[PDB]
């Protein structure tokens, strides 16, 4: 929330407040993606205790900025259920040369549903697609995997190369900024392949999209939690060198595990509450 700092000039503290409003807009949403913000830390210019503590207000607040804006695929996630229902409807009418091998894949395609839990949102998309991509190759009688341990990669089936560059470029922009994504890229022709593949490629695009939004989240969120754990243990090595009430007081603040965000989210609201008492421990000016 209301982050507070030590040796930063007021002109720089206002710039960090500007980072919150611009976070949805700026390309490449990562603190590592904006090196100049890391150069606002004032490292070497100030004492090493300030150099480590100054980042701790950012990484705790940058993690707060991620939780508040929140991933929100639910407006698109319901559309994923519709296209999965459309493949389920058109998947029965289509003839097969071995219906028993294919019908079992259709049953798993029907069972897929999203729970309220966010950690399961990625895994549910994968099984819903693997049952379809194995099915989509059968429509063109394409060769499919037989060896055990060789699950088929998720990929588009039979599409023009000009269509590929326009749609794959969007996936690179999903990792660039998961906060604002729309399924505007749709241009499948009725002439291509079959009505199944048109239902599938629209599903595979949303299916990769739910993962590319989710994988861009957890891979960064795991990193920001890892960064705080490194800065804290390095901070303890320096605070231990001096013994004082405020100095030992800071060591108790770092005893809480950074693992799981709520354990760290309480740490940020706590540290703001007691800024006045331990501030003397850090040299300044």
């Amino acid at each position: 929330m209301s982050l507070q700092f030590i040796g930063l000039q007021r002109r720089d503290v206002v710039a960090l407040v500007n980072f919150l409003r611009h976070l949805t807009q700026k390309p490449d949403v990562d603190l590592e993606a904006h090196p100049k913000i890391l150069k606002k830390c004032g490292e070497k210019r100030l004492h090493r205790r300030t150099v480590l503590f100054n980042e701790l207000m950012l990484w705790l607040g940058y993690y707060r900025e991620l939780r508040f804006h929140n991933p929100d695929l639910s407006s698109v996630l319901e559309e994923f259920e519709v296209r999965c229902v459309a493949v389920a409807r058109r998947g029965y009418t289509y003839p097969f040369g071995d219906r028993g091998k294919a019908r079992d894949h259709l049953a798993v395609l029907d069972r897929t549903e999203f729970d309220t839990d966010v950690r399961h949102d990625a895994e549910i998309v994968e099984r819903a697609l693997v049952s379809a991509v194995i099915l989509a190759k059968m429509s063109v009688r394409e060769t499919l995997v037989t060896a055990i341990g060789q699950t088929e990669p998720i990929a588009f089936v039979h599409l023009k190369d000009t269509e590929v560059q326009r749609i794959e470029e969007n996936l690179e922009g999903v990792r660039r900024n998961m906060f604002c994504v729309k399924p505007l890229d749709l241009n499948l022709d009725r002439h291509a392949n079959t009505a199944l593949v048109n239902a599938v490629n629209k599903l595979v695009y949303t299916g990769r999209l739910i993962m590319n939004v989710r994988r861009s989240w957890e891979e960064l969120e795991r990193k920001c939690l890892a960064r705080i754990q490194e800065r804290c243990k390095l901070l303890v090595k320096e605070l231990r060198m001096c013994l004082s009430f405020d100095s030992n007081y800071c060591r108790n603040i770092l005893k809480h595990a950074v693992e799981n965000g709520d354990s760290a989210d309480t740490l940020l609201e706590l540290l703001i509450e007691d800024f006045d008492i331990y501030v003397d421990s850090f040299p300044q000016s």
């Binding site: 037989t146 060896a147 055990i148 341990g149 060789q150």
Partner: protein, 49 residues
């Protein structure tokens, strides 16, 4: 025994060099210990040091 080279289930063969490679259902652990005394008795070490 078969293995899993890529896109294949090729057969594999490997000698069992030492006598201890045998399965416990064919080479019981009590068997190896009582068998061990046969050589110490051949070494005349019935009372081991």
């Amino acid at each position: 025994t078969h293995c899993q080279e890529n896109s294949e289930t090729v057969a594999l063969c490997t000698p069992r060099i030492v006598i201890g490679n045998l399965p416990d259902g064919l080479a019981p652990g009590p068997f190896h210990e009582l068998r061990t005394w046969e050589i110490m008795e051949h070494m005349r070490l019935r009372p081991p040091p």
